[PDB]
Amino acid sequence: LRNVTASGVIPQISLIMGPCAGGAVYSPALTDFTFMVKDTSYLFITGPDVVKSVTNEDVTQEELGGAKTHTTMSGVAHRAFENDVDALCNLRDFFNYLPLSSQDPAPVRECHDPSDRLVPELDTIVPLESTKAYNMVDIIHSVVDEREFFEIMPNYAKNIIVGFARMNGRTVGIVGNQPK
Amino acid sequence: KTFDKILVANRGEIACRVIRTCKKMGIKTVAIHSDVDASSVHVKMADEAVCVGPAPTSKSYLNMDAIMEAIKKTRAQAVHPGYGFLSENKEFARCLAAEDVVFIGPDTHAIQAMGDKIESKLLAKKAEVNTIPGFDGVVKDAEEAVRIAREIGYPVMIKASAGGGGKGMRIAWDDEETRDGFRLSSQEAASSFGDDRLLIEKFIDNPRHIEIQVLGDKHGNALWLNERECSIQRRNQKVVEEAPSIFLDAETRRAMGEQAVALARAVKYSSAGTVEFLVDSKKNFYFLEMNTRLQVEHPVTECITGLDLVQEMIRVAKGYPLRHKQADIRINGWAVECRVYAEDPYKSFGLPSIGRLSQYQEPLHLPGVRVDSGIQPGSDISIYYDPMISKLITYGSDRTEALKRMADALDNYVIRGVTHNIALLREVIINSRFVKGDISTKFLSDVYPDGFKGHMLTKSEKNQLLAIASSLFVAFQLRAQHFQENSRMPVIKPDIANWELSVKLHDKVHTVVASNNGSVFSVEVDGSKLNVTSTWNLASPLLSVSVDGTQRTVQCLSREAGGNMSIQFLGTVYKVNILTRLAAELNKFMLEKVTEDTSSVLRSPMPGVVVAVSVKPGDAVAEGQEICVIEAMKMQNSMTAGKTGTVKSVHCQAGDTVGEGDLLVELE
């Protein structure tokens, strides 16, 4: 009830850093972003013991609810980090993008990257041949402040790119196609 | 006065050089390009351009018939091919002259005259240069090997009458090992390729490669310019040259300059070219070869002679005499040039890389620096062309000023998107043997006998790098705390008195404590006090810092939340992992998991039909190299290699249909 009531009022970020089973698995489904830790975290409703008892299929813990599955195939986890220390270091930097409440404007932070500089690197990225693909990420990185881009779900639905960045100090969200 | 329109038959910085000179002269310049070079710099700088052909040079820059069509289509009057492609192609010059188009470069007589080694040696004998005699006969006896050497000279080489690769070769100086070397080769060589006939000739020790440039005149005149020292090289290609050598005094320069002219005036070389000499440790100069074409080492002599070689070549081709006399040619200072390639210097000294350029900034704000480049940001470098990025030229009044300015230009020279060779250039120019001048044509092979490793830091340099890396780390952490004022939720700046960091370099973990006092960070690195002062503009690719009065320029190439930071320091990229004291103490509890590098196994990322395979087993593969091309849903998808190696097997061929995950090619 609190997780639903808070939606659209304050952002809710969940990082899973271990096993998760039973009813606990639904709070990350109510929060705004879910992150995991590679090969350390799991997210499943029932364990492999129940699965084998119900249906005649064999599965292990990493296959049933591992971080790799949820970031690559089910589309549940937004990003997995290598270990506990790196996960919290990246979480602090992610935190700096978001407002404290929906009543606040997007955060604006000191920026040294001139807002009026040209980017000649863009003029020749897109090929003239219609059947030649190119990497959209080169455009995203060259536009955003100081070439810093926070990519969400890098390994799921690779044909569309979403993430956070800053332009002239202000947090923006970026969505684009990936012709590659 | 001069030509109205000149066509250039080349690409890149050499085409740019001609375009700039023509514009200075008021001459319209026509460029040619391939389909992939259509956006290159020289195409945009030229006044008119014609597309000749596709990406491979054999069909675009060596296609003389398509070029002839472009020459007449634009009503060009003269052609300047630069170097490389068709500069020595006689059939091109013949069919070009047949159409009364002025060719800028050698005529076909000079190209054929030096076509082979026999005519070149005969010219050196006639022009009277050197070409030291050997033994015009076969040595058969045990005493002939020494008796003949006694008549001609001292350092004597014994080699097979025909063959190579150590086919009984030995180096001898005195008579005892000359006799021994011959009889060993004459009795064992018969067991290799069935031939035991030995010849003797004369050799030199620690050679230096020295060039002298000559400007020919159609009226019979010819002048010689200051020499070039070209000893720093890899894979028989030069990388660093110096103009005002060091191995010559005023008399030697005149003596050798006159001989280089004697060669040019005896074949009537009414063009610009180069004569190559080898000098031994005793300052004895021997003829090596005569070159007919503007060299790639012509932008370093100009900085001390004050000439413009392209401007002069165009007037001579029009029919004007040389504008100078020999008494006016002098050394006005010193100039050194470094060639920058898109190559990995670690992989057997210069393995080509493939890629696109994302950041590029030439050091043109520094004094005495001239950058001659054919690229612009958003340029691609590919396997079809020699991976040249630029030639960096630095000059000064003395030898130390030109070298110091070169060191500065290299650290302020931003190349990102490809692998480059700046680390190698930055270390060689500061090598104690290079500064003193004890350089031979095999210099790099003795300095780096196990390959290039990178710049090695000393005690004071490690402390400066740790102080810079730690202060920059904190500078980012402080910038992160400066928010606009939120009237609803006031932000309170953490009152951090000291930053206690654990800084991991190669295999050591150092203790660094930093504090901020405005623009200066007071940093203690394992008990050593350093003060790092800067403006700390975190967006610029070039960060200028002052560490205890020492001026440094560094580049931050990457930064991660996990503490990883890549800093280029003195040309070499160092990987430093900066954790806070707390993170470092807890990080010891993390499992040291080991993963697998699966970059040699190339699988299909997408179902569809394979339409091209660029390889067969044994083919060399660079990182980023296209291997296979799969086309599904009206879209050509290139599959590239993630590893430098060779192909072991091609598992799917063109015409085969593959699914997701199927194995296409296997690399070593």
Side-chain angles (χ1 to χ4, degrees):
Chain A
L1 181 61
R2 267 78 177 179
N3 287 338
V4 173
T5 299
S7 176
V9 180
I10 57 171
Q12 301 174 93
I13 311 302
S14 176
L15 172 66
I16 303 168
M17 306 181 77
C20 182
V25 307
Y26 295 99
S27 292
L30 301 175
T31 64
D32 296 291
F33 295 93
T34 298
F35 299 97
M36 297 185 76
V37 180
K38 293 181 181 179
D39 297 317
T40 302
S41 295
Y42 307 92
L43 181 65
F44 55 91
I45 299 166
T46 63
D49 290 343
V50 173
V51 173
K52 186 171 175 64
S53 294
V54 173
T55 185
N56 293 328
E57 296 183 356
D58 288 314
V59 65
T60 191
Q61 189 64 77
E62 294 80 0
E63 290 174 326
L64 183 62
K68 288 191 281 290
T69 298
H70 284 309
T71 60
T72 304
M73 169 191 188
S74 69
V76 173
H78 288 97
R79 282 203 80 178
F81 299 95
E82 292 80 2
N83 64 67
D84 290 349
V85 174
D86 289 343
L88 295 173
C89 293
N90 284 277
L91 185 57
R92 282 174 59 86
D93 285 346
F94 180 78
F95 183 80
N96 288 334
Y97 283 95
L98 305 180
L100 297 176
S101 69
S102 65
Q103 294 178 331
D104 292 313
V108 177
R109 203 210 46 194
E110 179 179 357
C111 182
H112 300 168
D113 188 353
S115 67
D116 59 0
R117 66 174 170 87
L118 301 175
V119 187
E121 296 83 2
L122 297 174
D123 286 344
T124 58
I125 291 173
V126 177
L128 296 173
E129 185 178 1
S130 67
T131 58
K132 178 65 177 175
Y134 69 95
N135 184 1
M136 183 66 79
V137 172
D138 287 344
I139 293 167
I140 292 167
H141 284 170
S142 297
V143 171
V144 299
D145 286 350
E146 302 180 22
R147 293 147 192 275
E148 292 185 354
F149 175 74
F150 187 99
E151 187 177 0
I152 293 165
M153 287 183 174
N155 293 303
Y156 174 80
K158 292 178 180 178
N159 55 314
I160 188 164
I161 302 165
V162 300
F164 286 103
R166 267 163 202 121
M167 292 188 71
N168 201 15
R170 182 178 291 107
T171 298
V172 298
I174 297 170
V175 181
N177 293 118
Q178 175 65 293
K180 187 175 178 180
Chain B
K1 184 177 179 180
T2 188
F3 292 99
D4 298 291
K5 185 180 288 189
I6 299 170
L7 183 141
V8 179
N10 214 309
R11 52 97 71 194
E13 68 273 15
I14 188 65
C16 294
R17 177 103 133 69
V18 176
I19 293 163
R20 289 198 297 269
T21 300
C22 289
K23 286 182 179 295
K24 172 242 278 257
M25 296 176 72
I27 305 168
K28 299 293 186 182
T29 303
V30 179
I32 62 168
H33 61 84
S34 68
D35 59 333
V36 298
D37 288 340
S39 60
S40 67
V41 172
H42 73 277
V43 173
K44 296 294 185 181
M45 291 178 70
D47 300 288
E48 298 179 325
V50 178
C51 183
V52 176
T57 60
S58 67
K59 296 182 179 179
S60 64
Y61 293 112
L62 300 176
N63 184 334
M64 66 178 71
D65 290 343
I67 292 166
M68 285 300 292
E69 290 176 354
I71 290 166
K72 292 294 180 180
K73 182 177 179 180
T74 63
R75 299 294 194 265
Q77 297 174 338
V79 178
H80 186 190
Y83 66 89
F85 287 124
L86 296 168
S87 67
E88 295 181 352
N89 185 304
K90 293 192 287 294
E91 291 81 2
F92 174 54
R94 180 184 65 198
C95 70
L96 182 64
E99 297 298 323
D100 294 316
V101 182
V102 175
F103 181 77
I104 302 168
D107 63 5
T108 59
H109 178 72
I111 293 168
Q112 184 61 26
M114 296 294 104
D116 210 330
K117 307 285 189 194
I118 293 166
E119 294 80 1
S120 181
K121 288 179 180 178
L122 290 169
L123 180 65
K125 335 316 224 86
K126 290 179 180 179
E128 298 185 351
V129 178
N130 191 331
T131 314
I132 189 164
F135 184 51
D136 191 16
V138 176
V139 180
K140 294 182 180 179
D141 204 355
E143 298 295 349
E144 288 176 328
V146 298
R147 182 180 64 79
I148 298 300
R150 289 175 180 171
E151 292 180 352
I152 298 168
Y154 183 74
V156 59
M157 178 175 179
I158 301 168
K159 65 181 183 181
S161 67
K167 183 179 178 179
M169 293 178 177
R170 184 175 179 182
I171 304 301
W173 290 269
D174 205 354
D175 287 341
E176 183 66 20
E177 75 270 18
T178 297
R179 182 180 293 106
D180 188 57
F182 172 83
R183 64 185 179 183
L184 289 168
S185 294
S186 71
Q187 297 298 307
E188 297 180 354
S191 296
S192 66
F193 301 96
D195 197 323
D196 56 2
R197 294 174 295 171
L198 280 303
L199 303 178
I200 66 99
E201 297 183 356
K202 299 292 175 288
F203 68 92
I204 60 172
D205 63 5
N206 292 333
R208 279 78 170 177
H209 189 282
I210 299 169
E211 297 180 356
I212 298 171
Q213 184 176 339
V214 179
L215 306 179
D217 192 331
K218 288 180 181 292
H219 301 80
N221 198 5
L223 307 172
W224 60 276
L225 305 176
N226 295 308
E227 68 278 357
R228 294 185 291 270
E229 182 181 301
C230 304
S231 296
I232 304 296
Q233 65 182 341
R234 87 287 181 274
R235 302 185 185 180
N236 299 327
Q237 181 179 38
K238 309 296 185 287
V239 291
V240 176
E241 304 89 33
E242 192 140 33
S245 64
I246 188 164
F247 290 99
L248 287 93
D249 60 8
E251 183 67 23
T252 303
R253 291 188 184 95
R254 285 190 290 270
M256 294 300 102
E258 290 175 354
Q259 289 184 333
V261 170
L263 295 166
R265 293 185 184 181
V267 297
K268 307 297 183 185
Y269 187 77
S270 299
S271 187
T274 301
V275 179
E276 302 178 18
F277 295 90
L278 299 174
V279 65
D280 70 6
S281 69
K282 295 182 180 179
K283 302 185 181 178
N284 297 305
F285 287 74
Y286 304 83
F287 174 73
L288 179 62
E289 168 212 44
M290 178 177 178
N291 281 318
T292 38
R293 83 200 140 119
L294 209 42
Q295 220 38 211
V296 165
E297 309 89 345
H298 71 106
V300 77
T301 299
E302 292 178 331
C303 293
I304 60 168
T305 60
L307 305 175
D308 181 325
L309 182 60
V310 176
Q311 182 179 95
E312 189 66 22
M313 288 173 70
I314 293 167
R315 288 179 63 85
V316 170
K318 182 65 174 176
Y320 289 99
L322 292 168
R323 292 175 291 172
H324 300 286
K325 61 183 181 291
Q326 192 67 55
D328 295 320
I329 298 166
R330 61 182 182 271
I331 300 169
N332 291 309
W334 211 284
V336 58
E337 184 175 30
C338 298
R339 299 182 190 178
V340 181
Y341 291 93
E343 69 187 30
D344 184 351
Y346 291 77
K347 293 181 176 67
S348 299
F349 303 100
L351 192 143
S353 67
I354 303 166
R356 178 176 177 87
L357 301 170
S358 66
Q359 295 182 272
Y360 184 77
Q361 183 179 339
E362 296 179 354
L364 298 174
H365 61 287
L366 300 175
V369 177
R370 158 184 169 171
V371 183
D372 186 15
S373 175
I375 61 165
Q376 62 186 346
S379 292
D380 297 343
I381 299 171
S382 67
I383 63 170
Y384 289 97
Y385 302 81
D386 196 356
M388 180 69 78
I389 295 170
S390 69
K391 294 189 281 292
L392 175 63
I393 302 166
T394 299
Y395 63 89
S397 68
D398 210 326
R399 235 275 196 112
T400 59
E401 188 175 32
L403 292 171
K404 178 61 169 63
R405 285 176 176 173
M406 176 61 80
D408 293 347
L410 291 169
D411 289 316
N412 289 274
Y413 186 16
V414 179
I415 301 168
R416 301 178 184 180
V418 303
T419 300
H420 54 71
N421 63 320
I422 297 298
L424 178 61
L425 296 169
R426 180 66 176 81
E427 189 178 31
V428 169
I429 62 171
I430 205 71
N431 192 298
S432 65
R433 287 173 63 189
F434 190 81
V435 173
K436 290 180 180 179
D438 190 19
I439 300 300
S440 68
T441 59
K442 68 181 178 66
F443 172 76
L444 293 175
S445 295
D446 294 312
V447 172
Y448 304 96
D450 59 336
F452 180 71
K453 298 291 182 65
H455 187 282
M456 297 291 107
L457 302 174
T458 190
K459 289 179 181 178
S460 65
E461 291 171 328
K462 288 180 181 178
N463 286 336
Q464 290 177 2
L465 179 59
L466 287 166
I468 293 166
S470 294
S471 295
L472 181 58
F473 175 84
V474 173
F476 279 104
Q477 294 297 307
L478 296 173
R479 190 266 296 274
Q481 298 175 3
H482 296 168
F483 296 93
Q484 282 262 326
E485 183 67 21
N486 185 304
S487 67
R488 293 178 63 255
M489 298 292 285
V491 178
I492 300 171
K493 184 179 181 182
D495 190 19
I496 299 168
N498 294 278
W499 295 87
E500 294 182 354
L501 306 173
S502 176
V503 181
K504 180 177 182 293
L505 299 176
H506 292 167
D507 58 358
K508 303 290 183 289
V509 179
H510 299 263
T511 299
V512 180
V513 179
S515 63
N516 175 272
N517 197 33
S519 65
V520 57
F521 287 89
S522 174
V523 182
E524 181 178 332
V525 179
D526 294 318
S528 176
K529 302 291 188 179
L530 297 95
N531 292 275
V532 183
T533 300
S534 184
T535 61
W536 303 107
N537 181 329
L538 300 174
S540 176
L542 300 173
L543 176 65
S544 175
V545 301
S546 175
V547 183
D548 297 338
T550 299
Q551 185 71 51
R552 301 292 194 188
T553 299
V554 300
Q555 298 185 34
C556 182
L557 302 176
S558 69
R559 187 175 67 91
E560 299 183 356
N564 293 309
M565 183 180 286
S566 176
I567 300 169
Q568 184 173 308
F569 181 75
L570 304 176
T572 299
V573 178
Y574 300 95
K575 295 180 180 179
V576 60
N577 185 333
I578 301 169
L579 301 174
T580 63
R581 178 178 175 179
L582 177 62
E585 291 176 355
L586 295 172
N587 191 61
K588 73 184 182 181
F589 293 119
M590 296 294 103
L591 180 68
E592 296 181 355
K593 183 177 180 180
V594 179
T595 64
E596 183 179 359
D597 184 353
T598 58
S599 296
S600 66
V601 181
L602 306 178
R603 295 177 183 273
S604 173
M606 182 178 179
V609 176
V610 178
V611 298
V613 181
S614 68
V615 299
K616 68 186 187 297
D619 282 345
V621 175
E623 291 177 22
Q625 186 172 310
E626 182 177 298
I627 305 299
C628 298
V629 174
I630 315 152
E631 210 238 291
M633 294 169 54
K634 276 84 187 180
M635 178 69 65
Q636 311 278 353
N637 291 305
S638 295
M639 186 282 284
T640 63
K643 186 175 185 292
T644 299
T646 62
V647 176
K648 293 196 293 185
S649 180
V650 177
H651 293 284
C652 297
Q653 304 297 332
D656 288 339
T657 300
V658 299
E660 184 178 358
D662 285 343
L663 181 63
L664 300 172
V665 175
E666 182 178 357
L667 303 178
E668 185 68 75

